[PDB]
Design a protein around this ligand. Structure first.
Ligand SMILES: [Mg+2]
Ligand SMILES: [Mg+2]
Ligand SMILES: [Mg+2]
Ligand SMILES: [Mg+2]
Ligand SMILES: [Mg+2]
Ligand SMILES: [Mg+2]
Ligand SMILES: [Mg+2]
Ligand SMILES: [Mg+2]
Ligand SMILES: [Mg+2]
Ligand SMILES: [Mg+2]
Lengths: 70, 151, 65, 116
RNA sequence: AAGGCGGCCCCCUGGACGAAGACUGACGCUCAGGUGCGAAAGCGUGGGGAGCAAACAGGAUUAGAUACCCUGGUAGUCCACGCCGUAAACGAUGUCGACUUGGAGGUUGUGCCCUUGAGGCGUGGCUUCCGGAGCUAACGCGUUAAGUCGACCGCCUGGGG
């Protein structure tokens, strides 16, 4: 995420622009993942358990959509 | 408490100089519930300070307060094995009512001849930026600044 | 929409780098299909096209070399 | 001495400390400052404030070189990763670019094992 | 086929699937005993050894701590060729058939029009999720059945020993 400051401006927009550049690049989301070694069976289990939970909320949204609370 | 928001009660202003801040000082000074003796102690002591140093007894008493009023203190918070302090600013009502407690406890320690003497001295040094009250204020300010990276 | 390579029914080629540079980020990583909308059949060709341009130095591996 | 005009500010932040080094554009360092030696040994050298003071110290000891403009180059994801740049701005330098040179391996060597 | 397979390029090679036609004409299904393949660890003989890291050593916490935590670290993990033949080798569900209301998706061919630009109309092969009838002890399965039926094989007969 190399950022060159532009003409004038104050320090903050370029600074806050830099942070947004790294968030898109996800540099911190990678270093913490490679900080320790996770076994390939844990790699697959974690991915699946995330997906099935992601789907389950997706179907449960329509169930609450049809019902009313009061 | 858990949920209640409490409105405090106004106390009667002092008889002589008509200032509730002074009337709160005697209340903190009073021990065992006897305003008659406590009001004598503060009145004689304040008269002693005013005679020696300047006029306007209300300002004479006030000058000590601006030298003892704290600004930031530390409240302990625990996370894991060890608990560390956290700095936090102090609300104005707390600042006025924290200074008087520091002065009174400081007065009770000085080994002078009588309570009217010890209170008279302690307000004198505080008005000159000195004494046990000011050092106790300094200890809080140094410790709040020794560890303040926490937030 | 999401139709860019659906009109150009071919194999995605590596000497045409003007097309490719819109599917890579600023750092040089490959944009996932979920963003550009490219379907799977043309993402794999696009992914291989980049790795064939990366070897021949026509495209940067990373942002800073 | 040698009155170097514009230099580079390498910041090696980490999960447990922070090291700030200011060099010339050729790569020959000038002076450094870390949170560990700044007076925060223990559980404090890993806070944004401790990194801030470290950068402030590094702004000194380079007066004999007359640095004015910097190329801040962040590394080592940790707490003192951004607060040490704005501290360099408090030093009066006008920085001209910011870079994140963090070593990301394309699946190289196997990392250590997990902690229980 | 199962184990399993992940940068790019080449040259050797196996199996799937679809369109429209030709040909052989029951050539089929299952399979005791046999034969082959079979993660990781392990073994033998040569190489290689960056990073991890059993054993091992030191530091710490602890009543103790031959552990968890920290600092180092050898066999091993890597290559070639031979052995070993086991796993929660797990959709804990044998293989091959025909039949029995529906939705939401993924991926891969296709034949039409409406190459009217996006688009709609149909037909195949795998795969994910939800669910009707039915099934059952219940959980649950449910057109890829644990439903309704055939053909062969394997196995089960109280717990511990
Ligand atoms: Mg470690
Ligand atoms: Mg047999
Ligand atoms: Mg092995
Ligand atoms: Mg061996
Ligand atoms: Mg050997
Ligand atoms: Mg170890
Ligand atoms: Mg067995
Ligand atoms: Mg398996
Ligand atoms: Mg079994
Ligand atoms: Mg179901």
């Amino acid at each position: 995420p190399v950022i060159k400051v532009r003409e004038n401006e104050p320090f903050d927009v370029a600074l806050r622009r830099f942070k947004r550049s790294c968030e898109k690049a996800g540099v911190l989301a990678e270093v913490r993942r490679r900080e320790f070694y996770e076994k390939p069976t844990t790699e697959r289990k974690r991915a699946k358990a995330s997906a099935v939970k992601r789907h389950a909320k997706k179907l449960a949204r329509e169930n609450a959509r049809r019902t009313r609370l009061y | 408490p858990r949920r209640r928001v409490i409105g405090q009660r106004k106390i009667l202003p002092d008889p002589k100089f008509g200032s509730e801040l002074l009337a709160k000082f005697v209340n903190i000074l009073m021990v065992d519930g006897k305003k008659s003796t406590a009001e004598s102690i503060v009145y004689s002591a304040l008269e002693t300070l005013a005679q020696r140093s300047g006029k306007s007894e209300l300002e004479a008493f006030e000058v000590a307060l601006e030298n003892v009023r704290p600004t930031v203190e530390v409240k302990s918070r625990r996370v894991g094995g060890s608990t560390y302090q956290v700095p936090v600013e102090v609300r104005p009502v707390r600042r006025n009512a924290l200074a008087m407690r520091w002065i009174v406890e400081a007065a009770r320690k000085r080994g002078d001849k009588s309570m009217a003497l010890r209170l008279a001295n302690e307000l004198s040094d505080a008005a000159e930026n000195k004494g046990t009250a000011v050092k106790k204020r300094e200890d809080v300010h140094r410790m709040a600044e020794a560890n303040k990276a926490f937030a | 929409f999401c139709r860019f390579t659906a009109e150009g029914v071919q194999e995605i080629d590596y000497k045409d780098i003007a097309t490719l540079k819109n599917y890579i980020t600023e750092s040089g990583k490959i944009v996932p299909s979920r963003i550009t909308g490219t379907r799977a059949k043309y993402q794999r060709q696009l992914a291989r096209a980049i790795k064939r341009a990366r070897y021949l130095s026509l495209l940067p591996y990373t942002d800073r070399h | 001495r040698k009155q170097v005009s514009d230099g580079v500010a390498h910041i090696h932040a980490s999960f447990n400390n922070t090291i700030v080094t200011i060099t010339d554009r050729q790569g020959n360092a000038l002076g450094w400052a870390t949170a560990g030696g700044s007076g925060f040994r223990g559980s404090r050298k890993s806070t944004p404030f401790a990194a801030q003071v470290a950068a402030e110290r590094c702004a000194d000891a380079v007066k004999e070189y007359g640095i004015k403009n910097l190329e801040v180059m962040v590394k080592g994801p940790g707490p003192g990763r951004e607060s040490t740049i704005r501290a360099l701005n408090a030093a009066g330098f006008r920085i001209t670019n910011i870079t994140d040179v963090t070593p990301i391996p394309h699946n190289g060597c196997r990392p250590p094992k997990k902690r229980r």
